[PDB]
Every structure is written in structure tokens, then in C-alpha cells.
Amino acid sequence: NSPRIVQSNDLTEAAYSLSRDQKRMLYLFVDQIRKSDEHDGICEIHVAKYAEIFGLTSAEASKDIRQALKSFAGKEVVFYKGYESFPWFIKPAHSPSRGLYSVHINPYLIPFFIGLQNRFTQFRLSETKEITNPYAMRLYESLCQYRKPDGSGIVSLKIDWIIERYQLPQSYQRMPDFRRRFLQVCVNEINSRTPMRLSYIEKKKGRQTTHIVFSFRDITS
DNA sequence: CCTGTGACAAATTGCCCTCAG
DNA sequence: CTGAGGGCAATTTGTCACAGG
Ligand SMILES: [Mg+2]
Numbered sequence: 001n002s003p004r005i006v007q008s009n010d011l012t013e014a015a016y017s018l019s020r021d022q023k024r025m026l027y028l029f030v031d032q033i034r035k036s037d038e039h040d041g042i043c044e045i046h047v048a049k050y051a052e053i054f055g056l057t058s059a060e061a062s063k064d065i066r067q068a069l070k071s072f073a074g075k076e077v078v079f080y081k082g083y084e085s086f087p088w089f090i091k092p093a094h095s096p097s098r099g100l101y102s103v104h105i106n107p108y109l110i111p112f113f114i115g116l117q118n119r120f121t122q123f124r125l126s127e128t129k130e131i132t133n134p135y136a137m138r139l140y141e142s143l144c145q146y147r148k149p150d151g152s153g154i155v156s157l158k159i160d161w162i163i164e165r166y167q168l169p170q171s172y173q174r175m176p177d178f179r180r181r182f183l184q185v186c187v188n189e190i191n192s193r194t195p196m197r198l199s200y201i202e203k204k205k206g207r208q209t210t211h212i213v214f215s216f217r218d219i220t221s
Numbered sequence: 222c223c224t225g226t227g228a229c230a231a232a233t234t235g236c237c238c239t240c241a242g
Numbered sequence: 243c244t245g246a247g248g249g250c251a252a253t254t255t256g257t258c259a260c261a262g263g
Contacts, residue, residue: 020233047245060235062245098242099245132234132254171257176224181255207223 002053002125003031008115012145016077017167020134021064024054027125029105033113041107047099054129065101069093079112121145130193136186138166140194143214151196151218156203156211175209183212195219 005027018026028050029043051061073092078085086106093103123144131137146153163172172178183200191198197219203211 057236058243058245059238059247063247066246095246169256174224174258176226177257180225181257185254 002127002129004122004124005031006034006120006122007141008112009119009121009145010079010112010115012121012141013165014077014079015165015167016075018075018134019068019071020132020137021068022072022075023134023137024129025065025068027128028053029103030113033105033110036110039107039110041105041110043103043105045093045101045103047101053125069101069103127194127196131189133186133189135166135168135182136189139186140190140196143190143196143198143216147216151220152216154213154215156213158211159209162212 007030011030025045028045032043033039033041045065047058047062047065050056050065051058054061056064069092072088075088076085077088086109088106089104090106091104093101095101121141121144123140128137128140131140142157143153143155146155159175159178162168168182172182187198187200190196195218197217199215201213201215202209203213
């Protein structure tokens with residue numbers, strides 16, 4: 001039953017750092033954007049509906065959905081084919097009434113959310129909601145960019161490019177760490193908490209790894 | 222140069238309780 | 243009963259020294 005989340009490939013591949021909680025909210029606006037046209041670009045958020053859709057308590061849910069908002073100040077996203085740096089909101093959010101929050105999306109993002117009828121990413125929210133780690137979030141998010149209908153696919157990604165688009169810590173430049181605190185972690189989270197069955201092999205030129213080749217079956221078979 | 226691992230610091234997790242309405 | 247607050251211990255995340263190929 002989770003609402004199918006349908007995003008521009010543009011989005012799937014862009015450069016931003018958002019928290020777990022924050023990306024969670026990301027999925028929710030773009031849905032309200034999808035029932036929008038010729039838009040105003042304002043979005044409502046209902047605390048009760050959050051803690052039902054993400055299995056939280058009323059009280060904890062209202063922490064997650066407050067802090068996150070304050071830490072959208074500053075947050076940007078860079079678009080590429082291009083070096084076009086954008087910003088998430090224009091006025092901060094607020095709650096006219098008890099429980100509802102009205103955010104104000106930069107309406108110069110609307111077409112970058114509908115993108116193109118040619119190339120776009122889809123998935124259902126049910127897949128992703130038991131992920132704690134966000135980097136795991138971006139990955140499954142891209143991994144779906146390539147899924148063919150039966151739930152399977154293949155892809156090679158390049159380390160210099162994962163670092164940019166997903167915008168990871170500088171200390172991960174050394175691979176020994178990269179594979180410890182990002183690689184084995186995000187493959188373990190996905191292959192545990194989602195309906196996907198992953199594995200990986202490294203692509204090495206010379207004395208250095210450079211690509212990761214991701215390869216996945218829908219666990220449903 | 223490459224790597225893996227330990228140890229320490231700094232940020233998250235979910236869980237707890239107060240209080241106003 | 244709800245949600246706007248304060249606080250938390252345990253684990254998960256970011257860093258870097260050191261040992262060997
Ligand atoms: Mg929380």
C-alpha cells in the first residue's frame with residue numbers, strides 16, 4: 001500500500017546531503033507535488049499521518065519533523081550536463097495549527113520533479129522505510145533507476161562519482177575505510193530491510209579500485 | 222604506494238518523562 | 243487523548259595511528 005514514489009532521474013542523481021529523517025520527508029512532498037499541476041508549491045505535513053506511515057510515536061515523530069526542518073536552512077542541491085546549484089526552501093516552515101506544518105518549496109524545482117516522460121525512476125515507499133542509514137537510501141534510490149520490470153538489473157558505478165553525488169565524508173577517500181563504514185554497511189542494510197538481493201564486485205585498474213559493479217535480484221523469486 | 226584493524230571522538234538511534242491544552 | 247519540550251544510554255558513524263605486502 002505505500003504510495004508509488006515517482007522521481008526524475010535528475011533527482012535520483014544529484015548532489016546533496018540530507019539526513020535520514022529529511023530524505024524521508026523528501027519522498028512525501030514530491031507525492032503532493034505529483035497531485036499538483038501552474039502550481040503554488042506549498043505542502044502540508046500531518047504529524048499523525050507521519051507516525052502512521054513510518055510507524056512512529058506521536059511524540060518522537062514531532063521531534064523528527066522539527067529538527068529536520070530547522071536543518072533545511074543551509075541545505076543545497078547541485079544539478080548536472082551542468083553545475084547549477086539550488087536551494088531547498090525560500091521561507092522557513094511553520095505550523096498555523098497544532099500538528100500541521102506548511103513548507104514552501106522553491107518552485108524552480110517543480111519541473112525537475114516531474115522531469116521527462118522519457119527517463120525517470122520509480123519505486124514504492126514500502127521498499128525503503130526500514131533503512132536507518134541515508135547513504136543506503138541514495139543507493140537503492142539509484143539502483144532502482146536501472147531496474148527492469150521483473151525486479152532485477154545490473155550497474156557499474158565509479159567511486160569519484162559516488163563521492164560527489166551522494167556527498168560523503170572526506171575521510172572515505174581511503175578505500176580501507178570506504179569499504180568499512182560505507183560499502184559493507186549499505187549493502188547489509190539493503191539486503192536485510194528491503195525486498196532486494198544484492199552483491200558486488202570491485203573494478204580495478206592498476207593499483208587502485210575505481211568502480212563497483214552492483215548486481216541484484218528481486219528477492220521475490 | 223596498497224591495504225585491514227583498533228581506538229578515540231563525535232553524531233545518531235530509539236526510548237523515557239514533563240506539561241499545556 | 244495529542245503533540246511541543248527536555249533528557250538519555252547504546253550503537254552506529256567518522257577519523258586516524260600502526261603493521262605488513
Ligand atoms: Mg526520532
